Symmetry: none
Subunit: 141 residues, 2 copies
């Protein structure tokens, strides 16, 4: 599993001191490990990124759909508001002309009460005159 | 270049030139591969974050507009509720006005009766008072 026997031959590898071989293999090993470590790290990031991207793309999809519905509800409300505002305007007009009618009746009834009291007063005067003439008639008989 | 990072000066000069070239080439190939992986990862990271950043703005923009639309919709129901209560209360009031109007006419026809009746009593009062006057004349 040695990296050094790959690069050099058996004749020139054996010409290297133990110490020297140990240093080279140590460093060549570390380079092999970093390569695999980088490739390992890249995949962990890759799956994490793609995973996060899917889920936030999901949220957008839901948001879009919710907006479409809300916009549709707004428009439905605006229509029934417009229809009811016309309903109300006509109901106000009908009301304020019923107000007019009420005041007319209140005026009429108040006036006819005024006349009643006039007929009342005039009757009292004729009655008072009546009894006075009645009494003057009792002297002359 | 690279053979200096592995071995000290006095022991690396003890290696033949062909051996030095063979190690040096290999060491460089691996470092070239490492720096390649690092470059690869850095650019992928930068693309990955930008792609996420963009759609995040797209969501943020969409959620803001969902908030705007929800408020308007809520306020629209609000307007429609107050308006429905106006209608309801006005129908009730109009109903009562109609009933009062009908009742008022009944009263007016009643007051007319009392008027005619009083005028008839007054007319008779004038008749008896004239009769009484001419009778006084006769007696004095």
């Amino acid at each position: 599993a040695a990296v050094l026997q790959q690069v050099l031959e058996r004749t020139e590898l054996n010409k290297l001191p133990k110490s020297v071989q140990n240093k080279l293999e140590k460093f060549l090993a570390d380079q092999q490990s970093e390569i695999d470590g980088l490739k390992g790290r890249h995949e962990k990031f890759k799956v994490e990124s793609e995973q996060q991207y899917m889920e936030i793309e999901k949220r957008l999809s839901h948001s879009q759909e919710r907006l479409v519905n809300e916009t549709r509800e707004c428009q439905s409300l605006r229509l029934e508001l417009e229809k009811l505002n016309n309903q109300l305007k006509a109901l106000t007009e009908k009301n304020k002309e019923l107000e007019i009618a009420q005041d007319r009746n209140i005026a009429i009834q108040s006036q006819m009460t005024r006349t009643k009291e006039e007929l009342e007063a005039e009757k009292r005067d004729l009655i008072r005159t009546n009894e006075r003439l009645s009494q003057e008639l009792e002297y002359l008989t």
